[PDB]
C-alpha cells in the first residue's frame, strides 16, 4: 500500500531529522545556550515519528523510538511522562520482543511505586505475569508477580482483586506446588465468603477443592477435614459434593476400583467436568493399588 | 508443470467427461491424455488422466463427484498438481479386477 | 421421553445456575472499581478548585 | 416399576425447588445491588462535568489575564 | 400415587410462577444495564477530552511562563 | 397431556433466558473493560494536574 | 524480605533528613524569612516517608508520620490535604492499633462536616461503626454511628443507603431485648417496600420478622398484628410464613410444645434458619 | 424552544456581528493586531449563536455555524477545539443532511490520527459506517470502515470490539456471498472465544454459522469440516446445532424435500429464526 511505504519513508526522514536535531542541540547548548527547548522539541519529533511509525504497522523500531524519547525526557528530570512512554513502549514490544517489553514495564513499575501509586504497579505486575505465562512456559516467577499484585491490592483494601489473585495462585500451587499453601488459601477464601452479599452459596466449591487437596494428602486428613468443614459450615452438609466425596472415600476405603470409576463417571455424566478436577481424580485413582 | 503447481479444484463441466473418468483440465495448463499426480497432503497423492475442455477456467481442474470423493477433493480447495509419467514397460495393466454394483438403487 | 426432556431441563438449569455464579463476581468487581474511581475524582475536583481559587486570589490581589 | 417413578419424581421435585429458589434469590440480590452503581455513576458524572467547567473557565480567563499583562 | 401426581401438579404450577418471575426480572436487568452502558460511554468520552484539554493547557501555560 | 405442553413452555422460557443471559455476560464484560481505561485516564489527568499546579505555584514564589 | 529491610533503612535515613529539614527550615525562616516553600517540602518529605514506611510493612509509624504531616499541613492553613492525610492515617491505623484511628477518623468527619460534605461523613461514620462492632463489644456506639449515618443518608434523599442502616439498627435493637424500635423499623421498611416495582417480593419478609418480635410480648397482640398486616398486604397469606405462624400460635395456645418444636424442625428441614431466628424462636419457646 | 425564534433571529445577528469582527480583521486589526483574543471571542460568539440555533432546532443553521466556527478557530492553533467543533457539526448534520457530516467526520478522523487518538477515531469510523448502512445503500465503504476500525482496535489489544466488528463484517460478506472471508472470521472468532471460560458458551453458535458457510460452498468438504470441528471441541456434537447440521447433510444425500423441510419446521417450532439464517437456508437448499 502507498500509505505504508509513505509512512515508513517519512518516518526515516523524521528520525534522521531528530538525530541531526539532537546533535545540533548539543552544539547549540554551548554555542548559544538557549536553555532546554531544543531537547524537548527533539523529543516531540521522536514521539510523533514513533506514533506514525507504529501506524506504519512496524512495531520494534516504534518501541525503540519510544524508549529513546522517554530516556531523553527523563534526563531532563521529567519522570511521569517518561514512565508513561516506557509503558507504551512495553505495550508496543509485547508483539515484538517480550524481554524488552518486560524490562520497560519493570522500569515503569519501579518508578510508579517510587511515586507512590500501588494500583497501577499491581496492574502492571499482573500484566507482566500474564504475558510471562501465556507465551513463556514458567510459573514460579508468575506466582511471585501475582502474589506481589495481591499484596499491593490488599495494601489498599481491594478485596476482590486480591481474592481473585490469591485464588489463581492457590490453583497454580495445587496443580504444581505443594498443597499446604493451596489448602490455606482455599480455606481462607472459602471462609471469607459466608456473609457475601451476592456469593452466599458459592464458597461450597472452594471448600470442596480444599477437601480434595486434603484427600490428596491422606485419607485420614481427608475425613478429618471433611468432618471439620461439615460441622463448621452446616450448608455444605446438604451439598451434592459432600455426598460424592463420602461415596468416593468409602469406595476407596475397601479397594474396589469399579465403585470409584462408576462414581466419577456418573458424576461427570450428571455434570460436566472442568479439566482440573479430572486430573486430580486420575491422580487419586493412580494410587489405589 | 513438471515440478508441479498449486491449483484450485473445480466441478466437472459435462456428463460425458464425468463418465470418462478423466480429470477435466484447461488447454492452456495441460493437454488431453496427460497424467498428473494430485498432492492433497504429504502422504495423499492420486493419479489422474487429463482431458481438456473449453469451459475449464485457468488454474483449475474439473473433477467429477466420484473422482473428488475417492480422492477427497473439495471444490475451491488448493492441491498441488504435477506431471506424472507412467512406466509403461512395468505399469501397463494386464489384468485388473473391478468390483461392479448398480450405481443407483 | 419424559426422562430425556427432564435430563435436558437438568442440564439447562445447571448452566443457568453456573452463569449466575459467573455474573456475581464480575458485578462485584465492577462496583469495587467504581468506588475507588469516585473517591479519586472527588479528591481531584476538591484539589483543583481550592488550588486554582487560592492561587488566583493571591496573584490578582498583590497588584 | 412405580418405585423408580416415585424416586425420580422426588429427586426431580427437590432439585427443581432448590435450584429455582436459589436462582431467584440470586438474581434478586443482583437487582437490589445495581441501583448503588447507578447512583454512583450519576454522582461521578456530576463531579466530572463540574471539574470540566471550572478548569475550562479558569484557563480561558487566565489566558485573557496573561494577554492583558503582556 | 394420586397424592404424588397432585404434588407434582403443585410443583409445575410453582415452576411456571418462578419462570414467570425470572423472565421479567432478567428483562429489567437488561434495560437498566444497557442504560448504564450508554452513560459510562458518555462519561468516558468527556473524561478523555478533559484530559487532552488540560494537558495542552499546562503545555501552553508553561511555554508562556518561559516567555517571561 | 397438559403436562407435556407445560414442559414445552418450560423449555421455551429456559432457553430464552439462557440465550439472553449469555449476552448479558458479554455486555457486563465490555463494561468491565471500559472501566480500566477510564480509571487510567483519570489517574493520568490527576497526576499531570497535580504536578503542573504545584510547579507553577512554586515558580510563583 | 531484603526489599522491606532496605525500604526501612532508607526510610529511617529519610526521617533523619526530615527532622533535619523541619529544624533547619524553622531556623531559616527565623533568620532569613524565605517564605513557606520549605514547610511544604517538609510536608512532602513526611508524606513520602510515610508511604515508604507503608511499603516497609510498618503501619504504626506510617500512621504516625501521616498524622504529623496532616497536623503540620493544617497548621499551614490548608484542610483538604490535611483531611486526606488524616484519613490515610486512620486507614493505616485500621489494622494493628485502631483506637487512635477512631479519634483521627472523627477529626476527619468533623472537618468534612465543617466544610459541609455529607456523603463522605456518613461513609466514615459507618466505617467507625463497623470498627466498633468488629473490634469492640460496645454496641451502643455502633448504634449511634449507624443511626447518624442513616440520618445523613435519608436527609440527602439516599433512601436505599438509609434503609440498610435502619435494618442493621433494628436487628441490633431486637437483639438487646428492645422491640419498639425494631417493630417500628421493620413495619416502616415493609410499608415503604409495598409499592416498589422491584422490592415488593421482600415486603413480606420484613413484615414476618416484625410479627415474630411482636410475639415476644403476648399472643393476642401478635394475632392482631398478623391479621392487620394481612389486610394491608392481601397476598401475604400466600407465603408459608403465615401458615407457620398460625401453627405456632395454635400450638402455643394449648400448651402443645411437641407440635411447636416439630413444626419448627420441619420448617428448618425444608429451609434452614440463621442464628437470629433460631435464638428468637427458642426464646419464644421458653414460655 | 418552540417560541425561541426571536432570539434565534438575534443569533443570526450575533453571527452578523461575528461578520463585523471579520470586517475588523479586514480593516481594524491593523491597529488591533494584539486582539487575537478578540478573534477568540468572535469564535465564542459564533459558537453560542450556533448553540442557540441548535436549541431552536434549526439543524442546517446550527451545522453551518459550527463549521464556520471550526474554520475560523483552526488558525493553526487549538486543533483540538477545531476537531470538537467539526464533530459537533457532524452530529448536528446527522439528522437532516448527513453528507457533509461525512466529510467533517473524515477531517476530525485525520486530525485525531495525526494527534494520535485512536479509540475516538475508530468510534467515528463505526459512526460513518452505520450512517452509511442506515441512510445510504453503500456497503463496501462500510466494510472498509469496519475493517479499518477493527485494525485500530486490535492495534491496542482491544480484542472484543474488533471481534464484534469482524463478526458484523463476516455477516455482511456472507450476505454479500464472499464465503472465504466469512468462514475465516466466524471461525477465528469462535476459536478465540472458546479459549477463555467466560465465553466458551458462545463458540457453538459461531461454529454452526461457520459450518453453514462451509456447507454453502463445498458439500463434499462439509462433512470433513464438521468432523474437524467436532474433534476440535468434544462438546460440539451434543449441541443441537451439530445434530441438526448432521441431519441436513445426511438427508441431502438423497433428493427428499420432505426430510429437510420437516427438520427445519421442527427446529423452528422451538424458537423463531432470524432473517439471515432463513434467507441463507432458502437460497442454499434450493439446490
From Swiss-Prot, chain B:
Where in or outside the cell?
Answer: Cytoplasm
**Domain of life, per lineage:** Eukaryota
Q: What is the purpose of this protein?
A: Required for vesicle-mediated transport. Catalyzes the fusion of transport vesicles within the Golgi cisternae. Is also required for transport from the endoplasmic reticulum to the Golgi stack. Seems to function as a fusion protein required for the delivery of cargo proteins to all compartments of the Golgi stack independent of vesicle origin. Interaction with AMPAR subunit GRIA2 leads to influence GRIA2 membrane cycling.
Report the sequence similarity comment from the record.
Belongs to the AAA ATPase family.
Q: What assembly does the database describe for this protein? A: Homohexamer. Interacts with GABARAP and GABARAPL2. Interacts with GRIA2. Interacts with PLK2, leading to disrupt the interaction with GRIA2. Interacts with MUSK; may regulate MUSK endocytosis and activity. Interacts with CDK16.
Q: What is this protein called?
A: Vesicle-fusing ATPase
- Name the species this protein comes from: Cricetulus griseus (Chinese hamster)
Q: What is the lineage of its organism?
A: Eukaryota, Metazoa, Chordata, Craniata, Vertebrata
Relative to the complete UniProt sequence, the shown stretch is 1 to 104 of 744
From Swiss-Prot, chain E:
Which subcellular locations apply to this protein? Cytoplasmic vesicle, Secretory vesicle, Synaptic vesicle membrane; Cell membrane; Synapse, Synaptosome
PTM note says:
Phosphorylated by CK2. (Microbial infection) Targeted and hydrolyzed by C.botulinum neurotoxin type C (BoNT/C), which hydrolyzes the 253-Lys-|-Ala-254 bond. Cleavage inhibits neurotransmitter release.
- Cross-link Glycyl lysine isopeptide (Lys-Gly) (interchain with G-Cter in SUMO), sequence positions: 62-63, 66
- Distribution of this protein across tissues and organs: Expressed predominantly in cerebral cortex, hippocampus, cerebellum, adrenal medulla and retina with weak expression detected in non-neuronal tissues.
Q: Where is this site: (Microbial infection) Cleavage?
A: 63-64
Residue stretches making up the t-SNARE coiled-coil homology domain: 2-64
Q: Which family does it belong to?
A: Belongs to the syntaxin family.
Function according to Swiss-Prot or TrEMBL: Plays an essential role in hormone and neurotransmitter calcium-dependent exocytosis and endocytosis. Part of the SNARE (Soluble NSF Attachment Receptor) complex composed of SNAP25, STX1A and VAMP2 which mediates the fusion of synaptic vesicles with the presynaptic plasma membrane. STX1A and SNAP25 are localized on the plasma membrane while VAMP2 resides in synaptic vesicles. The pairing of the three SNAREs from the N-terminal SNARE motifs to the C-terminal anchors leads to the formation of the SNARE complex, which brings membranes into close proximity and results in final fusion.
Q: What is this protein called?
A: Syntaxin-1A
> Which source organism?
Rattus norvegicus (Rat)
This protein's gene is called Stx1a
- Which portion of the complete protein is shown here? 191 to 258 of 288
Swiss-Prot record, chain F:
Here the disulfide bonds are: none
Give the record's keywords alphabetically.
Cell membrane, Coiled coil, Cytoplasm, Lipoprotein, Membrane, Palmitate, Phosphoprotein, Repeat, Synapse, Synaptosome
Q: Where is this region: Interaction with CENPF?
A: 1-53
Q: Please list the residue ranges annotated as the t-SNARE coiled-coil homology domain.
A: 1-59
Keyword Membrane recorded: yes
> Where this protein primarily resides, as one coarse class?
cytoplasm
Cite a single GO MF annotation: calcium-dependent protein binding
Q: Where in the cell is it found?
A: Cytoplasm, Perinuclear region; Cell membrane; Synapse, Synaptosome; Photoreceptor inner segment
Q: Which residues belong to the signal peptide in this entry?
A: none
What biological processes does GO assign it? associative learning; axonogenesis; calcium ion-regulated exocytosis of neurotransmitter; endosomal transport; exocytosis; locomotory behavior; long-term memory; long-term synaptic potentiation
Q: What does UniProt say on post-translational modification here?
A: Palmitoylated. (Microbial infection) Targeted and hydrolyzed by C.botulinum neurotoxin type A (BoNT/A, botA) which hydrolyzes the 197-Gln-|-Arg-198 bond and inhibits neurotransmitter release.
Give the UniProt family note.
Belongs to the SNAP-25 family.
User: What exactly does this protein do?
Assistant: t-SNARE involved in the molecular regulation of neurotransmitter release. May play an important role in the synaptic function of specific neuronal systems. Associates with proteins involved in vesicle docking and membrane fusion. Regulates plasma membrane recycling through its interaction with CENPF. Modulates the gating characteristics of the delayed rectifier voltage-dependent potassium channel KCNB1 in pancreatic beta cells.
Can you say what this protein is called?
Synaptosomal-associated protein 25
Question: Which source organism does the UniProt entry give?
Answer: Rattus norvegicus
Q: What is the lineage of its organism?
A: Eukaryota, Metazoa, Chordata, Craniata, Vertebrata
Amino acid at each position: 500500500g502507498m500509505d505504508t511505504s509513505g509512512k515508513q519513508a517519512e518516518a526515516m526522514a523524521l528520525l534522521a531529522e531528530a538525530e541531526r536535531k539532537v546533535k545540533n542541540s548539543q552544539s547549540f547548548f554551548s554555542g548559544l545556550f538557549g536553555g532546554s527547548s531544543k531537547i524537548e522539541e527533539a523529543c516531540e519529533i521522536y514521539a510523533r515519528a514513533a506514533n506514525m511509525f507504529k501506524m506504519a504497522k512496524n512495531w520494534s523500531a516504534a518501541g525503540n523510538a519510544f524508549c529513546q524519547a522517554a530516556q531523553l525526557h527523563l534526563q531532563l528530570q521529567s519522570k511521569h511522562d517518561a514512565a508513561t512512554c516506557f509503558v507504551d513502549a512495553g505495550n508496543a514490544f509485547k508483539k515484538a520482543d517480550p524481554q524488552e517489553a518486560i524490562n520497560c514495564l519493570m522500569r515503569a513499575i519501579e518508578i510508579y511505586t517510587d511515586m507512590g501509586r500501588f494500583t497501577i504497579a499491581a496492574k502492571h505486575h499482573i500484566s507482566i505475569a500474564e504475558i510471562y505465562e501465556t507465551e513463556l512456559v514458567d510459573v514460579e516467577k508468575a506466582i511471585a508477580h501475582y502474589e506481589q499484585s495481591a499484596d499491593y491490592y490488599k495494601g489498599e483494601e481491594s478485596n476482590s482483586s486480591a481474592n481473585k489473585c490469591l485464588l489463581k495462585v492457590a490453583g497454580y500451587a495445587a496443580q504444581l506446588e505443594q498443597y499446604q499453601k493451596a489448602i490455606d488459601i482455599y480455606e481462607q477464601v472459602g471462609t471469607s465468603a459466608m456473609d457475601s452479599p451476592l456469593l452466599k452459596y458459592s464458597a461450597k466449591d472452594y471448600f470442596f477443592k480444599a477437601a480434595l487437596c486434603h484427600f490428596c494428602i491422606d485419607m485420614l486428613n481427608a475425613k478429618l477435614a471433611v468432618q471439620k468443614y461439615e460441622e463448621l459450615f452446616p450448608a455444605f452438609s446438604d451439598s451434592r459434593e459432600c455426598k460424592l466425596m463420602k461415596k468416593l472415600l468409602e469406595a476407596h476405603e475397601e479397594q474396589n476400583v469399579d465403585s470409584y470409576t462408576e462414581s466419577v463417571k456418573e458424576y461427570d455424566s450428571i455434570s460436566r467436568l472442568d479439566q482440573w478436577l479430572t486430573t486430580m481424580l486420575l491422580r487419586i485413582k493412580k494410587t489405589i493399588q | 508443470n513438471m515440478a508441479g503447481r498449486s491449483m484450485q479444484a473445480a466441478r466437472c463441466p459435462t456428463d460425458e467427461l464425468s463418465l470418462s473418468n478423466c480429470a477435466v483440465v484447461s488447454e492452456k495448463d495441460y493437454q488431453s491424455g496427460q497424467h498428473v499426480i494430485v498432492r492433497t497432503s504429504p502422504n495423499h497423492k492420486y493419479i489422474f488422466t487429463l482431458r481438456t475442455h473449453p469451459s475449464v477456467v485457468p488454474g483449475s481442474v474439473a473433477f467429477s463427484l466420484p473422482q473428488r470423493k475417492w480422492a477427497g477433493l473439495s471444490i475451491g480447495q488448493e492441491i498441488e498438481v504435477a506431471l506424472y509419467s507412467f512406466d509403461k514397460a512395468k505399469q501397463c495393466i494386464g489384468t485388473m479386477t473391478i468390483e461392479i454394483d448398480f450405481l443407483q438403487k | 421421553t419424559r426422562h430425556s426432556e427432564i435430563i435436558k431441563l437438568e442440564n439447562s438449569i445447571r448452566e443457568l445456575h453456573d452463569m449466575f455464579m459467573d455474573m456475581a463476581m464480575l458485578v462485584e468487581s465492577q462496583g469495587e472499581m467504581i468506588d475507588r474511581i469516585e473517591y479519586n475524582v472527588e479528591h481531584a475536583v476538591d484539589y483543583v478548585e481550592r488550588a486554582v481559587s487560592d492561587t488566583k486570589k493571591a496573584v490578582k490581589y498583590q497588584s | 416399576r412405580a418405585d423408580q417413578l416415585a424416586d425420580e419424581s422426588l429427586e426431580s421435585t427437590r432439585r427443581m425447588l432448590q435450584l429455582v429458589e436459589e436462582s431467584k434469590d440470586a438474581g434478586i440480590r443482583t437487582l437490589v445491588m445495581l441501583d448503588e452503581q447507578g447512583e454512583q455513576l450519576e454522582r461521578i458524572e456530576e463531579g466530572m462535568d463540574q471539574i470540566n467547567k471550572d478548569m475550562k473557565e479558569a484557563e480561558k480567563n487566565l489566558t485573557d489575564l496573561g494577554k492583558f499583562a503582556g
